Amino acid sequence: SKKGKDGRFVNPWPTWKNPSIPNVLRWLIMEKDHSSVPSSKEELDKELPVLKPYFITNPEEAGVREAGLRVTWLGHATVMVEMDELIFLTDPIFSSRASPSQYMGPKRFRRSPCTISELPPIDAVLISHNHYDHLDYNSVIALNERFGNELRWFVPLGLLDWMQKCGCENVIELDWWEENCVPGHDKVTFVFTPSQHWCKRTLMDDNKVLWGSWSVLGPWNRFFFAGDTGYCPAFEEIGKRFGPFDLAAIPIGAYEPRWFMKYQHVDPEEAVRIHTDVQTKKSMAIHWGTFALANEHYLEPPVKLNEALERYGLNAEDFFVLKHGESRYLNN
Amino acid sequence: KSKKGKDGRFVNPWPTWKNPSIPNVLRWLIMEKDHSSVPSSKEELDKELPVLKPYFITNPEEAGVREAGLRVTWLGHATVMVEMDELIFLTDPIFSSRASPSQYMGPKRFRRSPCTISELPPIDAVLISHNHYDHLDYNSVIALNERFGNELRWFVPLGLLDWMQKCGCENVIELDWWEENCVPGHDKVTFVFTPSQHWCKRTLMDDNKVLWGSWSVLGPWNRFFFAGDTGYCPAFEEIGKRFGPFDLAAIPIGAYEPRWFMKYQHVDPEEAVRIHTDVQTKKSMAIHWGTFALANEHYLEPPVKLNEALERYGLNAEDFFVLKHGESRYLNND
Numbered sequence: 001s002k003k004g005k006d007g008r009f010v011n012p013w014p015t016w017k018n019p020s021i022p023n024v025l026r027w028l029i030m031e032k033d034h035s036s037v038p039s040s041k042e043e044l045d046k047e048l049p050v051l052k053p054y055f056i057t058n059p060e061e062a063g064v065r066e067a068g069l070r071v072t073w074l075g076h077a078t079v080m081v082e083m084d085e086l087i088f089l090t091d092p093i094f095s096s097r098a099s100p101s102q103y104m105g106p107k108r109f110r111r112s113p114c115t116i117s118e119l120p121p122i123d124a125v126l127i128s129h130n131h132y133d134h135l136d137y138n139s140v141i142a143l144n145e146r147f148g149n150e151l152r153w154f155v156p157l158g159l160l161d162w163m164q165k166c167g168c169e170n171v172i173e174l175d176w177w178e179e180n181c182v183p184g185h186d187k188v189t190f191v192f193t194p195s196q197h198w199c200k201r202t203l204m205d206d207n208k209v210l211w212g213s214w215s216v217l218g219p220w221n222r223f224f225f226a227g228d229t230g231y232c233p234a235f236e237e238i239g240k241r242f243g244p245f246d247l248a249a250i251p252i253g254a255y256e257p258r259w260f261m262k263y264q265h266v267d268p269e270e271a272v273r274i275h276t277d278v279q280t281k282k283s284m285a286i287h288w289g290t291f292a293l294a295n296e297h298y299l300e301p302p303v304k305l306n307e308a309l310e311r312y313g314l315n316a317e318d319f320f321v322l323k324h325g326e327s328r329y330l331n332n
Numbered sequence: 333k334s335k336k337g338k339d340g341r342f343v344n345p346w347p348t349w350k351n352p353s354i355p356n357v358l359r360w361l362i363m364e365k366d367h368s369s370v371p372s373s374k375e376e377l378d379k380e381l382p383v384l385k386p387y388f389i390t391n392p393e394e395a396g397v398r399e400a401g402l403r404v405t406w407l408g409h410a411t412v413m414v415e416m417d418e419l420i421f422l423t424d425p426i427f428s429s430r431a432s433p434s435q436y437m438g439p440k441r442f443r444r445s446p447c448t449i450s451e452l453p454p455i456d457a458v459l460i461s462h463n464h465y466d467h468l469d470y471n472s473v474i475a476l477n478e479r480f481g482n483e484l485r486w487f488v489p490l491g492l493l494d495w496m497q498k499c500g501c502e503n504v505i506e507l508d509w510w511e512e513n514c515v516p517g518h519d520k521v522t523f524v525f526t527p528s529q530h531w532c533k534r535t536l537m538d539d540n541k542v543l544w545g546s547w548s549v550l551g552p553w554n555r556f557f558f559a560g561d562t563g564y565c566p567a568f569e570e571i572g573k574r575f576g577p578f579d580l581a582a583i584p585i586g587a588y589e590p591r592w593f594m595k596y597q598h599v600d601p602e603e604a605v606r607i608h609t610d611v612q613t614k615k616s617m618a619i620h621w622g623t624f625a626l627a628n629e630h631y632l633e634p635p636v637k638l639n640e641a642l643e644r645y646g647l648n649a650e651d652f653f654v655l656k657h658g659e660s661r662y663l664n665n666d
C-alpha cells in the first residue's frame with residue numbers, strides 16, 4: 001500500500017497520528033456534568049421523535065437487494081445498512097444504560113426504535129471500538145442467541161476472545177488496513193480502516209484492543225463507517241485507496257469540551273471535512289441524539305453541522321440527519 | 333385487637349411467624365430456574381403470550397375511574413396498575429429487562445414490558461411488597477421518581493425507608509404488619525400493610541433485614557387486596573376477615589415448581605385459589621408467572637393448574653381470571 005498503518009507502542013496501541021495528544025481518563029470524577037439539558041416527555045418527542053421502523057409494520061420489504069442502498073438509524077452508532085444483498089448492523093446498542101454497572105452510567109434519553117427480535121435477518125455486525133456506547137454485552141448476547149454462527153462478527157484485533165467468550169464463533173479480528181468477507185456473499189468486501197479514538201472497558205485494559213473505522217466495498221454501492229474518531233489524516237488516505245464511497249456514517253456528537261474531546265472526537269465541522277476527505281456522495285450523521293457523553297447541548301450537533309455545511313459550500317442534502325428509527329433509500 | 337398475627341422478630345431479623353415456614357433456603361441460581369419450560373423463538377411466545385398495548389397509550393384520556401368501579405391493568409410479573417377512587421397506584425414495578433443486581437448475570441424477562449415509565453398515566457402511589465429484584469427495580473424506582481416527585485407516595489415495608497431515600501424518594505412511608513396510612517390529599521383511601529409468608533434478600537447478610545407482606549387498600553368504594561409473594565399461611569384468613577370482602581386480589585400463581593423447596597415462599601395455583609377463598613374477594617387476578625423464569629415449571633403450566641384448582645373448588649374462570657400482558661379489565665361494584 002502507501003498509507004501509514006499501525007504499529008503498536010512498546011506495549012499498547014498508539015494512534016500514530018499527530019493530532020494525538022495524551023489526555024485519556026473516564027467519566028465519574030472530572031469535566032462530566034453537562035449543558036445539554038434534556039427534559040419534558042412531549043418536548044423530547046417533539047424535538048427528538050422516535051420513529052417506528054418499517055421492518056416492523058411491514059417486514060416483507062427489507063432486502064433492498066435492488067441496486068441502491070437503504071439505511072436505518074436505530075440510535076447513536078446503531079445503523080442498519082441494507083446493501084448489495086447483505087443486511088449489516090454497526091455498533092449495536094439496544095440497552096438503556098451503556099455502563100458496566102446498572103446503578104451508574106449513561107442512560108439513553110431516546111430509546112432504541114426497534115428490538116433485536118423485530119430486527120430483520122442481520123448478516124454481519126461491525127464494531128468500531130470497545131466503548132460501552134458501542135459494545136453492549138446484553139445486545140451481543142441477544143444477537144447470537146437469535147442468529148448464531150450465521151452472524152459474521154467483524155471485530156478489531158484484541159476482541160476475538162471477548163466475542164468467543166460471550167459465545168460467538170463467526171468472528172473475524174482485523175488490524176486497520178485488513179480485509180475479509182461474508183462467506184456466502186463473498187463478492188462484497190469489508191475493510192477495517194484507521195481512526196483516532198481510544199479503547200477501554202475496565203482498568204489497565206487501556207488501548208489493549210485496536211480502534212478504527214469500517215469500509216464496506218460492495219460490487220454495486222460502497223459504505224464507510226467512521227465510528228468514534230477525531231480529525232486525523234487517514235480519512236483522505238481511505239477516500240483515496242478506496243472511494244468514492246456512496247454513504248458514510250460520521251459522528252457529530254460528544255465534542256464539548258473541545259480542549260479535551262478534540263483529539264478523540266471530531267466536531268460537526270470536522271465531520272463535514274471527513275465527508276470531503278472520504279469522498280462520499282452523502283453522509284448520515286451517527287452518535288448524538290441518543291446518549292449524553294459530553295456537555296454540549298443535545299440538540300446543538302445538528303445545528304453546528306448545518307452551520308459547517310453552509311460554511312464549506314455544501315447543502316443539507318449532502319450531509320443529512322435522520323430521525324430516530326427513520327430509514328432512507330438511496331438508489332445512487 | 334382481635335387475634336392478629338403480629339411480628340415476628342427473632343434472633344436479629346424478622347422470621348415468618350406463621351407455623352408452616354422452615355428455613356433451608358439456597359437463593360436463586362439458574363440451576364433450577366434457567367429452562368425446564370424452554371421458551372423457543374419469540375414468535376412461539378407471541379402466539380402463546382402476546383404483549384398488548386395498554387389502553388392509556390392509545391387513549392391517554394379515560395385513565396381515571398369515574399368512581400363506582402375499579403380498573404386494573406397487568407404490566408408483567410407482579411406489576412399491577414390499579415385505578416380506584418381518584419387514585420392510580422402501581423404495585424411492584426419492574427420495567428427493566430433483567431431482574432438482577434448485575435447486567436451480566438440474572439433472570440431476564442422473556443416478555444417485554446407492556447409500556448414504559450414515560451408512557452404511563454399520573455401515578456399517585458407505588459406499593460412494594462418485598463425487596464427481591466423481581467419486585468424492587470432500581471432503574472424503575474429512579475425513572476418513577478424522575479417523572480414524579482413528592483407526589484409519588486412510596487408505601488414500603490419495614491426496613492426499606494433508607495433504601496428508598498438513598499434512591500432519591502422523599503414521600504416514603506414505612507409500615508409493619510396491620511399498619512395503616514394514606515395518600516396526603518386523598519384521606520378516604522387507607523393503605524394497610526398486612527402479613528404474608530415470604531423472605532427478603534438483596535445482598536449478602538441482609539437476609540430478612542427488611543420485611544415482606546401484602547397490601548390491603550381500603551377505599552370508600554372498592555376494597556382491593558394485593559398479595560405479593562407468599563406461600564400458604566393462616567394470615568390470609570386474618571387479612572380476609574379484618575378487611576373484606578374485597579373487590580380484586582392480585583394473587584401469584586407462578587414460580588412454585590420444587591414444591592418440597594418452594595412451598596413456604598411460593599403458593600401453587602391450588603393454594604392460590606385457596607388464597608382467593610381465604611381473603612374473601614369477589615374476583616382475583618393471576619400475577620407472577622409468564623414473565624420471568626424463577627423456577628422450572630413449564631411457563632404455560634400455571635394458568636392450566638389455576639383452572640384445574642378453580643374447578644376443583646367449584647369456581648369458573650369468571651371468579652379468578654388471568655390477563656394478557658398489558659390487557660386491562662374494568663369491574664363495577666354493587
Ligand SMILES: C[C@H](CCC(=O)O)[C@H]1CC[C@H]2[C@@H]3CC[C@@H]4C[C@H](O)CC[C@]4(C)[C@H]3C[C@H](O)[C@]12C
Nearest residue numbers: 024025026027028029030032104201202203204
Ligand atoms: C472518588 C472515589 C473515592 C473517594 C475517596 O477518595 O474516598 C474514587 C474511588 C475509585 C475511583 C474510580 C476508579 C476508576 C477510574 C479511575 C480514574 O482515575 C478516574 C475515574 C474512575 C472511574 C474513578 C472515579 C473516582 O476517582 C473513584 C470513584
Ligand SMILES: C[C@H](CCC(=O)O)[C@H]1CC[C@H]2[C@@H]3CC[C@@H]4C[C@H](O)CC[C@]4(C)[C@H]3C[C@H](O)[C@]12C
Nearest residue numbers: 027028029101103104105494495498499535538
Ligand atoms: C453502595 C455502597 C455501600 C452502601 C452502604 O454500605 O450503605 C457504596 C460504598 C462505597 C461506594 C463507592 C465509593 C467510591 C465511589 C464514590 C462515588 O460517589 C460513586 C461511585 C463509587 C465507586 C461508590 C459506589 C457505591 O456507592 C459504594 C460502593
Ligand SMILES: C[C@H](CCC(=O)O)[C@H]1CC[C@H]2[C@@H]3CC[C@@H]4C[C@H](O)CC[C@]4(C)[C@H]3C[C@H](O)[C@]12C
Nearest residue numbers: 099100101102103104432433434470495534535
Ligand atoms: C450489590 C449492589 C446492589 C444492591 C441493591 O441493588 O440493593 C451494587 C450497587 C452498586 C454496585 C457497585 C458500583 C461500582 C462498581 C461497578 C462495577 O460494575 C463492579 C464493582 C462496583 C463496586 C459495584 C459493586 C456492586 O454491584 C454494587 C455495590
Ligand SMILES: C[C@H](CCC(=O)O)[C@H]1CC[C@H]2[C@@H]3CC[C@@H]4C[C@H](O)CC[C@]4(C)[C@H]3C[C@H](O)[C@]12C
Nearest residue numbers: 137161162163164165166167362435436437438
Ligand atoms: C459469568 C458469566 C456466565 C455465568 C453462567 O454461566 O452462569 C459470563 C458469561 C459471559 C461472560 C462475559 C463475556 C465477555 C467478557 C469477557 C472478559 O474476558 C471478561 C468480562 C466479560 C464481560 C465476561 C464476564 C463473565 O464471565 C460472563 C458474563
Ligand SMILES: C[C@H](CCC(=O)O)[C@H]1CC[C@H]2[C@@H]3CC[C@@H]4C[C@H](O)CC[C@]4(C)[C@H]3C[C@H](O)[C@]12C
Nearest residue numbers: 100161162165200201202203204205206207208
Ligand atoms: C477482583 C478480582 C480478584 C479475584 C481473583 O483474583 O480472582 C480480579 C482478579 C482478576 C481480575 C480480572 C482479570 C482480567 C481483567 C484485567 C484488567 O486489567 C482488569 C479487568 C479484568 C476483567 C479483571 C477484573 C478484576 O480485577 C478481577 C476479576
Ligand SMILES: C[C@H](CCC(=O)O)[C@H]1CC[C@H]2[C@@H]3CC[C@@H]4C[C@H](O)CC[C@]4(C)[C@H]3C[C@H](O)[C@]12C
Nearest residue numbers: 357358359360361362437533534535536537539
Ligand atoms: C461458585 C462460586 C465459587 C466457587 C469456587 O471458588 O470454586 C461461589 C463463590 C461466591 C458465591 C456467591 C456468593 C453470593 C451469593 C450467596 C448465596 O448464599 C448463594 C448465591 C451467591 C450468588 C453465591 C453463588 C456461588 O456460590 C458463588 C459465586
Ligand SMILES: C[C@H](CCC(=O)O)[C@H]1CC[C@H]2[C@@H]3CC[C@@H]4C[C@H](O)CC[C@]4(C)[C@H]3C[C@H](O)[C@]12C
Nearest residue numbers: 099100101137162201202203433434435436437
Ligand atoms: C467489569 C466487568 C465487565 C467487563 C466487560 O464488559 O468486558 C464485569 C463482568 C462480570 C462482573 C462481575 C460479576 C460477578 C460479581 C457481581 C457483583 O454484583 C459485583 C462484583 C462482580 C465480581 C462483578 C464485577 C464486574 O461488574 C464484572 C467483573
Ligand SMILES: C[C@H](CCC(=O)O)[C@H]1CC[C@H]2[C@@H]3CC[C@@H]4C[C@H](O)CC[C@]4(C)[C@H]3C[C@H](O)[C@]12C
Nearest residue numbers: 100161162165166202205361362434436437438
Ligand atoms: C470476569 C472475571 C475474570 C475475567 C478475566 O480474567 O479475563 C471472572 C473471574 C472469576 C469469575 C467469578 C468466579 C466465581 C463465580 C463463578 C461463576 O461461574 C460465575 C460467577 C462468578 C462470581 C465469576 C464471575 C466472573 O466471571 C469472574 C469474576
Ligand SMILES: C[C@H](CCC(=O)O)[C@H]1CC[C@H]2[C@@H]3CC[C@@H]4C[C@H](O)CC[C@]4(C)[C@H]3C[C@H](O)[C@]12C
Nearest residue numbers: 028102103104105470494495496497498499500
Ligand atoms: C453511587 C450512586 C450515585 C453516584 C453518582 O453520583 O453518579 C448511588 C446513588 C443511588 C445509590 C443506590 C441507592 C439504593 C441502594 C442503597 C444501599 O444503601 C446501597 C445500594 C443502592 C443500590 C445504592 C447504590 C449506590 O450508592 C447508588 C447507585
Ligand SMILES: C[C@H](CCC(=O)O)[C@H]1CC[C@H]2[C@@H]3CC[C@@H]4C[C@H](O)CC[C@]4(C)[C@H]3C[C@H](O)[C@]12C
Nearest residue numbers: 103433434495498533534535536537538539541
Ligand atoms: C469495602 C467497602 C468499604 C468498607 C467500609 O466502609 O468499611 C464496603 C462498604 C459497603 C460494602 C457494600 C455495601 C452493599 C453490599 C452489602 C452486602 O452485605 C455485601 C455486598 C455489598 C455490595 C458490600 C461490599 C463491600 O464490603 C462494601 C463496598
Ligand SMILES: Cc1ncc(COP(=O)(O)O)c(C=O)c1O
Nearest residue numbers: 094095096138427428429471472
Ligand atoms: C439491558 C436493559 N436494561 C434495562 C432496560 C430497561 O430500561 P429502564 O429500566 O431504564 O426503563 C432494558 C430495556 O430494554 C434493557 O435492555
Ligand SMILES: [Zn+2]
Nearest residue numbers: 129131197228
Ligand atoms: Zn468511544
Ligand SMILES: [Zn+2]
Nearest residue numbers: 131133134228
Ligand atoms: Zn462513543
Ligand SMILES: [Zn+2]
Nearest residue numbers: 462464530561
Ligand atoms: Zn420473592
Ligand SMILES: [Zn+2]
Nearest residue numbers: 464466467561
Ligand atoms: Zn417473586
